[PDB]
Each structure stands twice: as structure tokens, then as C-alpha cells.
């Protein structure tokens, strides 16, 4: 009937709460398709996932399929302009990304809902006729090189690659997926390879319709989405490529019973325990590896982790199954190590085996399966509506694994109790099948191997037969008990009717010395959930580096003692976030509203009556000192951002001041700080969700009453509700702060052009200018000039003040990066002069759509309200108001804004730059085809942050709405 369609699936199973409509189909050429119609959506989206990745790279061109992923964006026959795709998305309120894993290359975008076809037409060409232009191939290899360079000194990437280097060197698993300039240009040139032909051959060979899945989400009817996808994708050619498969495990006999001793970059101590397993993917209706991951990774009473933590050996544990590829998987148990735990690795692993033995002894528990199943069914029914871009991307990957009809449910719904599969996987978790890796700075100078891609220092050893035999004879330990029934499992899903006095925005329903309560009953999502957000103000959380340490330590110690009890709640969809701030403490409780007052009451009560276990105190103090030290290993651009915050904020304690004050934190001293912190508070809260005004007032007053009861809390004075100010930079001044990153051999730079206080006009001048320069400067500073992989521009907002920032990480020195940003900015003035009024209005419209895009789920709406609350602007209707103003702006207005605040000879230019030098740039000068860079003045070099701050005015704070 339709030659272009092989079949239309039956009804796609969805949550009864899901108003989107769905149609599955397979095209004649083999492409699996899901169409999602959402007549409400502001942004439309599509994604395509090709079932080939890294594991299919040619053995002689490592990173090719990842390079090819980069190259596809850079022009096609129909749309040859190198940034046609990204320009079009940017001008229509869209964004795009892609990723390459071992078996998939996944490409996705969103866009304004009226420009779906235009975005999709351009996207579709990536799969039809890429140009692989020779000149952008030569440029873009630098971006990929620069992606690898940022990962080199990253502990997680070094470990990911080291695993692959220690399995069978003949297995595709051993491949280096990222590639670099060496693998992708230098060595291919040496070996006479034409990389353009290789990209074309690989695309021709594997970009076959039979390995593709496409997902499209739009306002259009399912018939209209259907015709669209047929129109654009049925020309993709079927080469009938067999799906790559890897039935032989990369870890064979000689790779089992091995021990690795690895030297990390950061001062971290971890143990990684791995068992190879078969591919359990086909068992998704029973999911035996999840059942075992739930048990072995449990954190409640009776758990593996409870015992290892009581012994003072470990603080956290991850366990369960881990993906490999079609044909192989892994089962892991990874723990961090205390200093004692480091000396007790053999005992830790014996406990692991005793816990596993306990699972064998008790047998598979249908009631455990049934709990998993019940929780998954509730999670599925009440799942938050996803943002279109992540939703289409994720479904495109899974269309390759599940029947069309099951794609939404397949990952949630458990159907089959399989005690036979559970025993089978359990039979793999034996000491004869074990790989053990220990990461520790203690192994420095004690290693004799080097992994080639990252430089990782390590040593390999057979585990002694004596150690194995002892692990094999692990018997039952009375400390290990299966969890009991999870009582946090919610059963009340009633949606309270909308109150007669319910408001579109949060209403201030309580305004007392003690607490300010903003409340909104959900009028949009209608799921049985709520968010309860509390800011606790106290000047004692940040009065000095010592107090700041104590605030941190107190809250980590609290979360650590609550952890056993809160883990059940967290499995049951009820979580909390508790952290110290520069103003006090932040608490958020989210998830099913049912049992949420219980967890909340427990937290406040524990906080207000807290008793510190001295052993937990010492372990967590040592972890925190390392955590402060480990900042030295963060990335240069992260360093640049951190220093700018320190420079621009009235009060900010540095990592070095914090670490020096940490030796002075004693138990007695922490015990005294806590009652002191809690003796006087102001609480500002947002309670938002499936809750009434009276339940909100009750939760609020329960929190105060618990603090009053146990901690004798008294209100703060209004005048002590101290917000910090941003440093006010002088007209025409340019200051430079310089540091070195001692770990990474790239530079980072952050450049800040401070404008003025936030307000309706200043906001939208800045945001419009940003919108306009956003794609161009990625295109200029990355795509064309290839300064680095990380190239960022956009508004910076802090402390009621704002401005334009640029963040780049590069091999080039900061003074150089600076001239290029300055050259770029001139290009942008000319470009704004040269652009049509309609081009101008498309930018206003794109920013408009971006600002007006509706929250799809509760917590995204809360976050918007919460940003208004914590900034003390309380501008809940900002979006309509800012957008109405924006549409008023002209080309002339933006030219004038640029000329006044931003241009190199602007009368009110306020520029600060943070320069972070690469490990190997020794010292360095602060000042120094391609567009022409203007001459810059001599910067004032900041020598001392305190003096810099003392010598400048401070801005006002923004007035509340």
C-alpha cells in the first residue's frame, strides 16, 4: 500500500499520564522509526542513532568513526556551507550534539517547533551526502585532538582506557575510540592514507539504513510526521551490513585472577573489582543483573557497604552490571578506600565474597523481584515529561534493542521472575573469575608499565593461589542480612483537587522573623510529587575559613549517618540534597509526596540533635583535605572560572585558606559549632507540587518547631540577611590575574566584560547580543581558528550584576587567545552592521522562543522560581516582561550597547581576564586568513586578590520585585 514503509507497529505502550501520541514503523530500507506528536511542545526534535561506533574503527586509524561524527556537521552536498546546520539551528532557537560509543553514533537536535522540517532536512543530509571537505578535515582534527588532550590527565578516562589495554589486545575492546591529531592526521600522512577517502569509505560501508533508527518529535500529526520521515529518510541506502558482534569476552583465562596497581593523578584511593559475564541484554524482562546489583550495591542495614563502612574501610560502594558490547558485559563492585581500607584490600574482597555467598545461601527472592517490579511500574507511570532533545536521542539508541511496541516500557517494566538466570549470573561472581585494580598514590615509583594513550603508570601481578583459595572458602558472616521490606514505597498517588485560591506563581503565604514561605500548588503536571526547598541563613556558615570547613563537615557527617535510612527512600523515589552555602545551608526534598514529610522530619530532627561519631569525623576530614588538594588537578578553564568568582565576589575563602584552616578543626570545636550554627536562623522556602496551602504551612512550621524544640533556634535580624556584592570595575580598566595549572598542559582563559546591574533593559541588551554572537564565535574561535575544543561565550550573572564572558581552553597562550577574542568582537560589530533587519528579527525571535520555552516537569518549574527566590529578585513573570521588551529592540540599540560597554575603545568597558597557563608555559607575557586583532592597552596585573578588592567600589544589590 505504501512501498516506502515496510510496516507500522501496533500501539506503542505508554504511561496513562503521557499525553504525547506515538507511532512506530520500519521503513522499506530498514530504518526503525518512532514518531512522537506533541501539539503543545515549544521545541521540536529528532535524533538518529547508527548502530556502529568505535569498536568498528579500522585498526590502523584509531578514532575514525568519532572523527567522522565531527565531520558530518561540517557540510553536505545539499547544504555545503560548513556551518549551515549550526547557523540554522541557532537562528531558530535549536541546539544539536552527537556522541560516539563503542557501537553507536548518535546525533540529535532540537529546534523551534515551526522549523522542524528545515532542521530535519539539513540533518538528514548527514546520512546521505557529507562533503568531508578537505580544509575542514584539516581544521577539525584539532578539535578532536583537543577533546583528547582535556581527557589525558582525567582519572576516569585513564582507567576506562587502562581496562581496555589489559584485556585481549586482539579484541576490538582494546581500541582507542577518541583518536587524536597523531592517529588521525600525522600517522595517516606517514602511511600514505587519504583520510577524506577513509571517511567516505567508512560512511559508505557502515552508514547503512539497516543499522539506523530515527526518532522525531513535533507538533505535527502522526500522519504528517510519517510523511515527513518517509520524504527524507527513505533515500538512505540499504547496504545490508551485518551488525557487528563480540561473542568472545575480551577477558579470557589469562586476564582473570589479575591485580593492577595504578598511580592516579588526583590523590584518590579506590578498589575496582570486575567479573566478566555474558551479555544479559536479551534478559531485559527479568533483568537478573539488576536484581543482583540492587542486592550487592545496597546501602541499607545488613548490606555489604554497612559492614565495610563500620570497619572503617570504605565510604561508598557501586555494584551491579556494566555494559560491554553485543556479546559481553561486566559485573563490578567498586569502593573508595580509607587509609585503613587501603591496607585491608584482601579482607574487603573476602567480605564481598561472603556477601555473595549469603546470596547463594538464601536463594533468589521473589519478594525482592516483586519490589523492583512494583517500583519500576510506579516510576514508569509517573515519569516526568522529558525535554525533547534527550528523549529522542535516548529512544533512537534503544529502538535497536526492543520491539517498536516496547520502546517506552522496555527499560522499566519487569515481567518475569527468573531464579535460574539469577543463579547463573551469581555463578560467575567467583574468585577464579576476578580482576582487582587498586588506585593509589602509594604505588608511585613502584610501577613498571605505561599505558600508551594516556601515560598511565601501573603494575600487573597474578593474584596468589593462596589468596584466591581463601576467597573461595568465604563462609557466612552474621553481619550480612538481606534488606527487609522497603517501607518508603509510596502507595498514595491521589492528586489533590486544585484549591479555589491557587495561584499561577508562588505566593508568599508566610512572612515572619523566622521564615518566608513561598507556595504553589501544581496546576500543570499533575503527578503525585512535590519539591520542598529550604535556604537556611546563618552568618556562622561562612564567617571564616574555619567555619566554612565546619559547615561542610557537619553536613557531610549528617548525610553519612542518615545514609542507611535514606537509601530506602531514595530507591522509593524520594531524595534529598543537603549542602552548606556561603550563606548557611540548602535543603531540598523531592519525589513522591506520600512519605515525604517523614524523611523531612527525620532530617531536621537529626540535624538539630546531631551526635558526631569520632571515627566518621576523622575519615571524612581526611577525605575533605584530599578533596581541597585535588582541585589542583581540575581543568585550566575550571581554574579560570574559580579565580574569577574569587576576584569578583565581596567575600570568598580560597581553597588554600580552607585547607590551612582544616588542621584546626577538632571534634570538640565541631561539637560547639553546630548548636552555634543552629541557634539563630532565617528560613526561606519554596514548597511546590501536589500539596495544599495548609499542608505547606504545616511542613514549614514542623521544620521550625523541630529546630526550636531541639536547638532553641531564634530568628535572625533583617539586617543580618547579608547578600555579597560584586566588585565594581572602573570605566576603561583592564585587569589581568595569572596562575599556572600544574597538572594539565593546556591553557584556560576567562574574559569578563562587566556591563551593569541586572534590569529589564540591561538583561535583554546583553542576552540579545549573546544570541547574535553565540554560533559565530563557536564557528570562528573553534571551527575556523581551532583554538580549542572548549570554546564558550554567553552572559555571566552573579550577585545582581552581569556581563559578557568568553571561556576557552587551548594549547595557545592566554595573551594570544585574548587577541583572537578581540578580533572576533570587531568581526561581530561589522556583522551586526551588515545583517538584514529580518536576520536581526530572527535572533529576537530565537531568544524569545528560548526564554518562553515551558517547563515540562515539576522540578524545572521549581528551579525557575527558586532562581527568583535565591537571587531575591522575586520576578516570577520575568519571561513575558523581558520578552515583550526584547521585541522592541533595534539593530541601532545593539550597536549602541556594543559601542558604549563592549568595544575596545568603549567609554564604559570593564574588562577582567583570568589567565591560566599550561603546566609547561613557564612564566609568560600578559599581552602580545585571520581577521585583524586591535591593539590592546597594558593591563593592570592583579598581584593580590584582597588588595584588588579593597581598592575598588562594590556594586549595589538589585532591588526585589
Amino acid at each position: 500500500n505504501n512501498p516506502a514503509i515496510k510496516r507500522i507497529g501496533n500501539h506503542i505502550t505508554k504511561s496513562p499520564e503521557d499525553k504525547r501520541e506515538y507511532r512506530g514503523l520500519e521503513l522499506a530500507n530498514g530504518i526503525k522509526v518512532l514518531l512522537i506528536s506533541d501539539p503543545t511542545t515549544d521545541k521540536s526534535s529528532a535524533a538518529l542513532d547508527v548502530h556502529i561506533g568505535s569498536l568498528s574503527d579500522p585498526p590502523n586509524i584509531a578514532g575514525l568513526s568519532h572523527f567522522c561524527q565531527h565531520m558530518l556537521f561540517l557540510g553536505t552536498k545539499k547544504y555545503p556551507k560548513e556551518n549551515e546546520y549550526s547557523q540554522f539551528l541557532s537562528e531558530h532557537a535549536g541546539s544539536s550534539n552527537a556522541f560516539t560509543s563503542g557501537e553507536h553514533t548518535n546525533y540529535y537536535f532540537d529546534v523551534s517547533h515551526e522549523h522542524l522540517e528545515g532542521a530535519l532536512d539539513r540533518f538528514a543530509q548527514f546520512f546521505l551526502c557529507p562533503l568531508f571537505d578537505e580544509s575542514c578535515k584539516d581544521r577539525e582534527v584539532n578539535a578532536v585532538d583537543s577533546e583528547h588532550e582535556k581527557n589525558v590527565m582525567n582519572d576516569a578516562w585513564r582507567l576506562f582506557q587502562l581496562e581496555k589495554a589489559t584485556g585481549n589486545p586482539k579484541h576490538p575492546f582494546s581500541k582507542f575510540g577518541t583518536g587524536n591529531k597523531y592517529t588521525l592526521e600525522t600517522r595517516p600522512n606517514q602511511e600514505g592514507i587519504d583520510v577524506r577517502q577513509e571517511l567516505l569509505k567508512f560512511h559508505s560501508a557502515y552508514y547503512s539504513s539497516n543499522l539506523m533508527a530515527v526518532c522525531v518529535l513535533g507538533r505535527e500529526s502522526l500522519d504528517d510526521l510519517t510523511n515527513l520521515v518517509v520524504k527524507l529518510f527513505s533515500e538512505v541506502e540499504n547496504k545490508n551490513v551485518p551488525l557487528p558482534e563480540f561473542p568472545e569476552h575480551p577477558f579470557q583465562e589469562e586476564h582473570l585472577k589479575q591485580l593492577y596497581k595504578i598511580v592516579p593523578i588526583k590523590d584518590i584511593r579506590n578498589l575496582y573489582v570486575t567479573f566478566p559475564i555474558p551479555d544479559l541484554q536479551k534478559y531485559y524482562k527479568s533483568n537478573p543483573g539488576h536484581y543482583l546489583g540492587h542486592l550487592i550495591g545496597h546501602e541499607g542495614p545488613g548490606s555489604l557497604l554497612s559492614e565495610l563502612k563500620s570497619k572503617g574501610w570504605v565510604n561508598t560502594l557501586v555494584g551491579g552490571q556494566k555494559e560491554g558490547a553485543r556479546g559481553f558485559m561486566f559485573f563490578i563492585i567498586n569502593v573508595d578506600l580509607t587509609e585503613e581500607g587501603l591496607l585491608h584490600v584482601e579482607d574487603i574482597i573476602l567480605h564481598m565474597f561472603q556477601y555473595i555467598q549469603k546470596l547463594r545461601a538464601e536463594g533468589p527472592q521473589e519478594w525482592v523481584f516483586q519490589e523492583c517490579k512494583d517500583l519500576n511500574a510506579v516510576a514508569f507511570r509517573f515519569k516526568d515529561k522529558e525535554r525533547p532533545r534527550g528523549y529522542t536521542s535516548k529512544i533512537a539508541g534503544i529502538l535497536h534493542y526492543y520491539p517498536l511496541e516496547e520502546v517506552l516500557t522496555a527499560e522499566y517494566l519487569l515481567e518475569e521472575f527468573r531464579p535460574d538466570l539469577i543463579e547463573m549470573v551469581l555463578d560467575k561472581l567467583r574468585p577464579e573469575n576476578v580482576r582487582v585494580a587498586i588506585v593509589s598514590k602509594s604505588f608511585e615509583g613502584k610501577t613498571d608499565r605505561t599505558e600508551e594513550w594516556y601515560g598511565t603508570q601501573y603494575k600487573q601481578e597474578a593474584i596468589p593461589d593462596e589468596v584466591i583459595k581463601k576467597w573461595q572458602n568465604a563462609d557466612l558472616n552474621g553481619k550480612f542480612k538481606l534488606p527487609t521490606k522497603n517501607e518508603f514505597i509510596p502507595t498514595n498517588f491521589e492528586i489533590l483537587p486544585l484549591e479555589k485560591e491557587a495561584t499561577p506563581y508562588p505566593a508568599l503565604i508566610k512572612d515572619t522573623a523566622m521564615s518566608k514561605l513561598w507556595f504553589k500548588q501544581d496546576d500543570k503536571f499533575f503527578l503525585p510529587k512535590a519539591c520542598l526547598n529550604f535556604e537556611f541563613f546563618s552568618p556562622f556558615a561562612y564567617v571564616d575559613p574555619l567555619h566554612c570547613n565546619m559547615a561542610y563537615l557537619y553536613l557531610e557527617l549528617l548525610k553519612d549517618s542518615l545514609n542507611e535510612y535514606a537509601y530506602a527512600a531514595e530507591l522509593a523515589g524520594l531524595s534529598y540534597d543537603l549542602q552548606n552555602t556561603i550563606y548557611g545551608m540548602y535543603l531540598s526534598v523531592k519525589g513522591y509526596n506520600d512519605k515525604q514529610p517523614i524523611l523531612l522530619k527525620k532530617i531536621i530532627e537529626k540535624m538539630a540533635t546531631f551526635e558526631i561519631d569520632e571515627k566518621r569525623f576523622e575519615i571524612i576530614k581526611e577525605a575533605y583535605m584530599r578533596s581541597l588538594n585535588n582541585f589542583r588537578a581540575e581543568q585550566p578553564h575550571q581554574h579560570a572560572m574559580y579565580y574569577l568568582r574569587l576576584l569578583m565576589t565581596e567575600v570568598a575563602w580560597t581553597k588554600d585558606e580552607l585547607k590551612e584552616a582544616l588542621d584546626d578543626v577538632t571534634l570538640p570545636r565541631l561539637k560547639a559549632f553546630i548548636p552555634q550554627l543552629l541557634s539563630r536562623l532565617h528560613i526561606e522556602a519554596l514548597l511546590h507540587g501536589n500539596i495544599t496551602k495548609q499542608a505547606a504551612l504545616g511542613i514549614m512550621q514542623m521544620v521550625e518547631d523541630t529546630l526550636i524544640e531541639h536547638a532553641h533556634t531564634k530568628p535572625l535580624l533583617p539586617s543580618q540577611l547579608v547578600r555579597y556584592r560584586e566588585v565594581q570595575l572602573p570605566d576603561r580598566g583592564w585587569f589581568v590575574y595569572q596562575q599556572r595549572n600544574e597538572v594539565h598542559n593546556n591553557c584556560g582563559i576567562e574574559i569578563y566584560y562587566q556591563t551593569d546591574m541586572q534590569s529589564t533593559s540591561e538583561n535583554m541588551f546583553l542576552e540579545l547580543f549573546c544570541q547574535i554572537i553565540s554560533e559565530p564565535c563557536f564557528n570562528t574561535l573553534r571551527t575556523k581558528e581551532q583554538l580549542g575544543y572548549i570554546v564558550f561565550s554567553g552572559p555571566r550573572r552573579a550577585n545582581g550584576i552581569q556581563g559578557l564572558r568568553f571561556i576557552i581552553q587551548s594549547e595557545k597562550p592566554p595573551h594570544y587567545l585574548e587577541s583572537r577574542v578581540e578580533a572576533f568582537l570587531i568581526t561581530m560589530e561589522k556583522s551586526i552592521e551588515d545583517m538584514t533587519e529580518e536576520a536581526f528579527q530572527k535572533h529576537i525571535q530565537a531568544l524569545a522562543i528560548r526564554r518562553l520555552d515551558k517547563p515540562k516537569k515539576l522540578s524545572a518549574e521549581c528551579a525557575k522560581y527558586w532562581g527568583e527566590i535565591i537571587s531575591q529578585q522575586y520576578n516570577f513573570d520575568r519571561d513575558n516582561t523581558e520578552v515583550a521588551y526584547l521585541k522592541t529592540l533595534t539593530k541601532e540599540d545593539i550597536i549602541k550597547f556594543y559601542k558604549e560597554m563592549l568595544a575596545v575603545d568603549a567609554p564604559r568597558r570593564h574588562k577582567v581576564s583570568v589567565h591560566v597557563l599550561a603546566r609547561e608555559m613557564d612564566s609568560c607575557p600578559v599581552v602580545g586568513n585571520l581577521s585583524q586583532a586591535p591593539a590592546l592597552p597594558q593591563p593592570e596585573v592583579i598581584q593580590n586578590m584582597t588588595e584588588f578588592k579593597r581598592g575598588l567600589p562594590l556594586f549595589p544589590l538589585v532591588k526585589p520585585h
Binding site: 539488576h290 546489583g293 540492587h294 550495591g297 546501602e299 561508598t316 560502594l317 557501586v318 555494584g319 551491579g320 552490571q321 556494566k322 563490578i332
Partner: peptide, 5 residues
């Protein structure tokens, strides 16, 4: 925790 996410 269960390996994810």
C-alpha cells in the same frame, strides 16, 4: 548504590 546511570 546500583551501577547505572
Amino acid at each position: 548504590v546500583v551501577s547505572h546511570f
